[PDB]
Ligand binder design. Structure first.
Ligand SMILES: CCNS(=O)(=O)N1Cc2ccc(Cl)cc2[C@H](C(=O)Nc2cncc3ccccc23)C1
Ligand SMILES: CCNS(=O)(=O)N1Cc2ccc(Cl)cc2[C@H](C(=O)Nc2cncc3ccccc23)C1
Ligand SMILES: [Cl-]
Lengths: 305, 297
């Protein structure tokens, strides 16, 4: 019993965190095998950030301009290349702590653990989701750039996010591990604002199934809905459209609890209309959208209370 | 910017988790040096049950390696299994007993394999609102100060309300609980007042200031109001501990208490604080200072 925002154990990622320094800038890098991956903005000054020409800034650098520190050991850089918005620093030592890993690009609504780091040293781990507007609501201070997001399903680490910047609203933007940004963002100090965000509907539904599994049904009703009518109501509360893929994905939770997806959709419609009336659902007074259907199946029991 | 329920990096603890099997029961153990610590319920008259066991009855698995048990002893509600191999991954550590209101990270494990990490607090009723399934017994709670892991909790059981009970690493339970199948229940819980105030300061640091007001209160008047809303009494020690956050934001502790009093009597009126519609009490003053400063390990 219980339901917590749970992150993956971070040990496999901690053994990959390094500090990368280029001139006056210091940030974090991910050391996998003989390569250190870090945001390419490490080669920039604050002035450069308005309109940086990364190819022009990088051509002026040599291997020995990049200082890489792994714990108390200085790693020697023997090569460098840029791939999209990430810099790849070839080092002379392979990381002996390199786990089994993959680079995966996630979609909005997907969750992942973040190991927040400063000076190549991990400070904390938290769970979060890629918002529909492609930003993440993280907890990051100056020096956190290069911190990574990941999932560890079956001993293999899937790296999905590298932190690059904070937007004016306090939310965060970054790239996959191939350097492609999530969202219409650029690693440039320009007028960039997060788009209007929406609630991840399939995740709220997963979390309502988690409350049913843990023994709570106060929010259910005798009604059902069509998918179209549900979406017409959902859009009015800034909820993402629910697709047939989402309905298919919620199939296992529907069979475990005995509650049809469109019947849970009817209950969600009623919660949006009425609020919670002093009640909570899994210790929350708001509808929670940072647990995927997969996270609910992973954390919750296979036996409904 | 941002404010998340953040746990300590769990790597130093992951390298200590093992699987302990005794007969039909399988649970988790903590392998430090040549000793494996686990709940004694893995084997009730515990001395009578233990005397009938030999070292070879305890099967200990560390990854894919079987550890050999060469001795066993009981300390309160914790079983200590002497093994023939010292853990090469043993970190610098201490066993510490925490107080209600203090927070810690939990590395939830099943079959000696870590599955998740979350942050939680020791409630005033000595229970923890954790997330544990069958097989999680022996999962541990900890904090990190510099490079030293301070182990403060070992999971033993789930109470009828779905909350959890356990011991420090010396086997002493937190709360009036016993390790056995009998009628047990969590007492009426209260809100950790000093933690709610710390979270209000974290909100002000993050730009959420709508709840601030021109008013102040006495400590006595605040405690009379707080006792009515099932909030723990605020002591002068709590006021002293909130000193740094008060100087950083310019809001006196009793000035923030007047904000808390108004939130308790009138509610949030459709508003949120750090994305929450409830007053959050699982961040200590030290957790707020650490998350809004970037302390590393
Ligand atoms: C308010 C952030 N603007 S800044 O400090 O002037 N700035 C400009 C900038 C522009 C573009 C790119 Cl790719 C990076 C960056 C860096 C940047 O976003 N870093 C930071 C990242 N995450 C959290 C932070 C939390 C406080 C401060 C910096 C943080 C540095
Ligand atoms: C609901 C508890 N009843 S039980 O399963 O028969 N039971 C009785 C018991 C009595 C005394 C002690 Cl010290 C331990 C325990 C164990 C116990 O609390 N384990 C469990 C721990 N955490 C989460 C669980 C989530 C579902 C089930 C068990 C869980 C086992
Ligand atoms: Cl995905």
């Amino acid at each position: 019993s219980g339901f917590r925002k749970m992150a993956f154990p971070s040990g496999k990622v901690e053994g990959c965190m390094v500090q990368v320094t280029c001139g006056t800038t210091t940030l974090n890098g991910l050391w996998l095998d003989d390569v250190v991956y870090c945001p390419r903005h490490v080669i920039c000054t604050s002035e450069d950030m308005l309109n940086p020409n990364y190819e022009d800034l990088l051509i002026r650098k040599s291997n020995h301009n990049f200082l890489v520190q792994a714990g108390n050991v200085q790693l020697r850089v023997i090569g460098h290349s840029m791939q999209n918005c990430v810099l790849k620093l070839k080092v002379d030592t392979a990381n002996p702590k390199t786990p089994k890993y993959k680079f995966v690009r996630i979609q909005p609504g997907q969750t992942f653990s973040v190991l927040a780091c400063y000076n190549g040293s991990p400070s904390g781990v938290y769970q979060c989701a890629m918002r529909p507007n492609f930003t993440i609501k993280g907890s990051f201070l100056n020096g956190s750039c290069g911190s990574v997001g990941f999932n560890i399903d079956y001993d293999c680490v899937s790296f999905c996010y590298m932190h690059h910047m904070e937007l004016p609203t306090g939310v965060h933007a970054g790239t996959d591990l191939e350097g492609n940004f999530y969202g219409p963002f650029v690693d440039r100090q320009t007028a960039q604002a997060a788009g209007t965000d929406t609630t991840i509907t399939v995740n709220v539904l997963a979390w309502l199934y988690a409350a049913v599994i843990n023994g709570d049904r106060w929010f259910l009703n005798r009604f059902t809905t069509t998918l179209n009518d549900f979406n017409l109501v959902a859009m009015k509360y800034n909820y993402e459209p629910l697709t047939q893929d989402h309905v298919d994905i919620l199939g296992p939770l529907s069979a475990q609890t005995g509650i049809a997806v469109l019947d849970m959709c009817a209950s969600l419609k009623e919660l949006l209309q009425n609020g919670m009336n002093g009640r909570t659902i899994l210790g929350s007074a708001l509808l929670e959208d940072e647990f995927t259907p997969f996270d609910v199946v992973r954390q919750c029991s296979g036996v409904t209370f």
